[PDB]
Design an enzyme around this catalytic site. Structure first.
Site, PDB file in Angstrom:
ATOM      1  N   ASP B  25      19.490  -3.490  33.441  1.00  0.00           N
ATOM      2  CA  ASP B  25      18.436  -4.493  33.488  1.00  0.00           C
ATOM      3  C   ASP B  25      17.280  -4.063  34.371  1.00  0.00           C
ATOM      4  O   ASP B  25      17.316  -4.271  35.595  1.00  0.00           O
ATOM      5  CB  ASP B  25      19.033  -5.800  34.011  1.00  0.00           C
ATOM      6  CG  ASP B  25      18.147  -6.978  33.754  1.00  0.00           C
ATOM      7  OD1 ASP B  25      16.981  -6.782  33.322  1.00  0.00           O
ATOM      8  OD2 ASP B  25      18.615  -8.115  33.973  1.00  0.00           O
ATOM      9  N   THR B  26      16.255  -3.468  33.756  1.00  0.00           N
ATOM     10  CA  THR B  26      15.078  -3.030  34.492  1.00  0.00           C
ATOM     11  C   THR B  26      14.366  -4.234  35.129  1.00  0.00           C
ATOM     12  O   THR B  26      13.570  -4.075  36.064  1.00  0.00           O
ATOM     13  CB  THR B  26      14.083  -2.279  33.591  1.00  0.00           C
ATOM     14  OG1 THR B  26      13.636  -3.141  32.528  1.00  0.00           O
ATOM     15  CG2 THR B  26      14.728  -1.034  32.990  1.00  0.00           C
ATOM     16  N   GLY B  27      14.658  -5.433  34.619  1.00  0.00           N
ATOM     17  CA  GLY B  27      14.008  -6.649  35.093  1.00  0.00           C
ATOM     18  C   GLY B  27      14.696  -7.216  36.312  1.00  0.00           C
ATOM     19  O   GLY B  27      14.192  -8.155  36.937  1.00  0.00           O
TER      20      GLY B  27
HETATM   21  C1  LIG Z   1      13.606 -13.207  35.227  1.00  0.00           C
HETATM   22  C2  LIG Z   1      13.634 -11.800  35.809  1.00  0.00           C
HETATM   23  C3  LIG Z   1      12.429 -11.539  36.704  1.00  0.00           C
HETATM   24  C4  LIG Z   1      14.915 -11.613  36.620  1.00  0.00           C
HETATM   25  N1  LIG Z   1      16.102 -11.807  35.778  1.00  0.00           N
HETATM   26  C5  LIG Z   1      16.472 -10.528  35.132  1.00  0.00           C
HETATM   27  C6  LIG Z   1      16.397 -10.656  33.612  1.00  0.00           C
HETATM   28  O1  LIG Z   1      16.706  -9.381  33.035  1.00  0.00           O
HETATM   29  C7  LIG Z   1      17.384 -11.710  33.116  1.00  0.00           C
HETATM   30  C8  LIG Z   1      18.814 -11.156  33.113  1.00  0.00           C
HETATM   31  C9  LIG Z   1      19.783 -12.099  32.441  1.00  0.00           C
HETATM   32  C10 LIG Z   1      20.404 -11.704  31.270  1.00  0.00           C
HETATM   33  C11 LIG Z   1      21.305 -12.567  30.650  1.00  0.00           C
HETATM   34  C12 LIG Z   1      21.585 -13.819  31.197  1.00  0.00           C
HETATM   35  C13 LIG Z   1      20.961 -14.215  32.385  1.00  0.00           C
HETATM   36  C14 LIG Z   1      20.057 -13.346  32.997  1.00  0.00           C
HETATM   37  N2  LIG Z   1      17.119 -11.937  31.715  1.00  0.00           N
HETATM   38  C15 LIG Z   1      16.665 -13.099  31.259  1.00  0.00           C
HETATM   39  O2  LIG Z   1      16.392 -14.046  31.974  1.00  0.00           O
HETATM   40  O3  LIG Z   1      16.484 -13.164  29.822  1.00  0.00           O
HETATM   41  C16 LIG Z   1      16.241 -14.408  29.187  1.00  0.00           C
HETATM   42  C17 LIG Z   1      14.996 -14.155  28.337  1.00  0.00           C
HETATM   43  O4  LIG Z   1      15.472 -13.518  27.138  1.00  0.00           O
HETATM   44  C18 LIG Z   1      16.849 -13.888  26.920  1.00  0.00           C
HETATM   45  O5  LIG Z   1      17.657 -12.700  26.805  1.00  0.00           O
HETATM   46  C19 LIG Z   1      18.692 -12.666  27.802  1.00  0.00           C
HETATM   47  C20 LIG Z   1      18.684 -14.032  28.502  1.00  0.00           C
HETATM   48  C21 LIG Z   1      17.328 -14.639  28.159  1.00  0.00           C
HETATM   49  S1  LIG Z   1      17.340 -12.401  36.667  1.00  0.00           S
HETATM   50  O6  LIG Z   1      18.552 -12.359  35.906  1.00  0.00           O
HETATM   51  O7  LIG Z   1      17.024 -13.792  36.910  1.00  0.00           O
HETATM   52  C22 LIG Z   1      17.607 -11.590  38.052  1.00  0.00           C
HETATM   53  C23 LIG Z   1      16.857 -11.800  39.217  1.00  0.00           C
HETATM   54  C24 LIG Z   1      17.106 -11.094  40.382  1.00  0.00           C
HETATM   55  C25 LIG Z   1      18.145 -10.167  40.399  1.00  0.00           C
HETATM   56  N3  LIG Z   1      18.428  -9.470  41.526  1.00  0.00           N
HETATM   57  C26 LIG Z   1      18.925  -9.957  39.271  1.00  0.00           C
HETATM   58  C27 LIG Z   1      18.641 -10.663  38.106  1.00  0.00           C
END
Ligand SMILES: CC(C)CN(C[C@@H](O)[C@H](Cc1ccccc1)NC(=O)O[C@H]1CO[C@H]2OCC[C@H]21)S(=O)(=O)c1ccc(N)cc1
Lengths: 99, 99
Positions: B25-27
């Site tokens: 997860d690059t995000g």
């Molecule tokens: C919102 C971002 C700035 C940060 N998020 C990472 C992100 O990759 C999350 C990572 C993620 C992945 C799956 C479930 C929850 C969170 N993905 C996500 O929110 O995706 C949503 C949008 O598209 C859909 O596809 C997947 C879920 C939906 S995060 O999960 O909240 C996050 C924040 C801080 C850290 N240290 C680790 C993770």
């Protein structure tokens, strides 16, 4: 090009005639932008993030300029900590992960 | 190797004696895993994302095997809906985004 990950992989996007920054986010299936005006109709969509589920606005077939390339696709609008370019648009750009 | 983004980039990791699947997860700034126990001291933390914030425990200097390679760094543990490998560990494998 190649983008390392010591800092957030942030790129400039142009959407709805607006210049913004956004996170390249391989953990996101979908592209999610902070509230803004987009053309056309939207449909309801629920996405599950780390904090739980959120109602967002789904706009389809939206033109975005990213990294010098025009992509066109689904943009979700809603309350997000940051604009995130998800895999739906990163694939349009031909992004891969490499090690 | 080169990992596509047509599908979620999930890989096998070994951590805390346990084999798991995790999202590259690059995000994600930091690695956050679903609730489990890890050795050593930890400090409480809140991370924010799409659905809001979750309370996690931060363990530092935790050894993890990802893609056959052994790395070390911070691992956040808590009620995330999925296991996420963040930038902090991806860098240590020399992961890059390429297009
Ligand atoms: C919102 C971002 C700035 C940060 N998020 C990472 C992100 O990759 C999350 C990572 C993620 C992945 C799956 C479930 C929850 C969170 N993905 C996500 O929110 O995706 C949503 C949008 O598209 C859909 O596809 C997947 C879920 C939906 S995060 O999960 O909240 C996050 C924040 C801080 C850290 N240290 C680790 C993770």
């Amino acid at each position: 090009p190649q983008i390392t990950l010591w800092q957030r992989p942030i790129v400039t996007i142009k959407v709805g005639g607006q210049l913004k920054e956004a996170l390249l986010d391989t953990g996101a299936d979908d592209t999610v932008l902070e509230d803004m005006e987009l053309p056309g109709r939207w449909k309801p969509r629920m996405i599950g993030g780390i904090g739980g589920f959120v109602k967002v606005r789904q706009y389809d077939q939206i033109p975005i300029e990213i990294c010098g390339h025009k992509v066109i696709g689904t943009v979700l609008v809603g309350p997000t900590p940051t604009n995130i370019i998800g895999r739906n648009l990163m694939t349009q750009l031909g992004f891969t992960l490499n090690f």
